[PDB]
């Protein structure tokens, strides 16, 4: 198994502290398949069902069971091995394109 | 204080560390997030390594494959240095290749 670009994955969130409860969190994979396999990292954007109309929220579209918004400005390269990533879903191509567009705007 | 694009900042770590800020200035100020890549003295020759350039005290490579958006205030971000524009462009060039 390796995460694919466009996948919705569940990642272990395992803080050793803080008020936020440990557990699995959904996120969208925006990094290339080959990157993910070779580095053992995956660049991901968190997914949430809290919809505030925040400018960097990208609505999840083209899925089977997954709802909510992607938070594009929270983009992170995460260790999908250590965090035991599991692919549970996937989004549309234009969903990924929208998120990546936001990120590239942020870093340019 | 706010992190600027091109800044080398020190960040608190977890289970202080240098990182390059690639996110836009106004983005860092408004959102409270900084998109950064870690800098390391180990040169392993990975294809995603970018050599640091145009700096005073800072050496090593920037890891584009480890890019993270983080809360810079919560990590007590402080700017100790900066890098050349061509350096940021190269890092950002690698990141966009990764996610496209």
């Amino acid at each position: 198994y390796c995460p694919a670009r466009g996948d919705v994955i569940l990642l272990d969130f395992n803080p050793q502290s803080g008020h936020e409860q440990a557990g699995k969190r959904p996120a969208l994979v925006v990094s290339d398949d080959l990157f993910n396999q070779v580095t053992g990292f995956a660049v991901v954007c968190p997914i949430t069902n809290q919809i505030k109309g925040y400018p960097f929220e990208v609505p999840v579209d083209g899925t089977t069971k997954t709802t909510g918004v992607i938070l594009a400005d929270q983009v992170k390269s995460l260790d999908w091995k250590a965090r035991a990533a599991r692919t549970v879903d996937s989004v549309s191509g234009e969903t990924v394109t929208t998120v990546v567009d936001m990120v590239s705007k942020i870093i340019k | 204080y706010c992190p600027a694009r091109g800044d080398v900042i020190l960040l608190d770590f977890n289970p202080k560390r240098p990182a390059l800020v690639v996110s836009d200035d106004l983005f860092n100020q408004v959102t409270g997030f900084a998109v950064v890549c870690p800098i390391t003295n180990q040169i392993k020759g990975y294809p995603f390594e970018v050599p640091v350039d145009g700096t005073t005290k800072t050496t090593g490579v920037i890891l584009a494959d480890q890019v993270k958006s983080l809360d810079w205030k919560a990590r007590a971000a402080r700017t100790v240095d900066s890098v050349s524009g061509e350096t940021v462009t190269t890092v950002v060039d690698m990141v966009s290749k990764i996610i496209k």
Binding site: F13, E20, A27, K105 | R17, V30, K68
Partner: peptide
């Protein structure tokens, strides 16, 4: 839209806490 245009609509009511703020395994930061 433009980064400026995007950033212009950020508010106090709008913003999100940082998800997945922990560091695991290989992560440097």
């Amino acid at each position: 839209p433009t980064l400026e245009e995007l950033l212009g609509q950020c508010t106090a009511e709008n913003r999100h806490h940082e998800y997945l703020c922990d560091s695991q395994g290989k992560e440097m930061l």
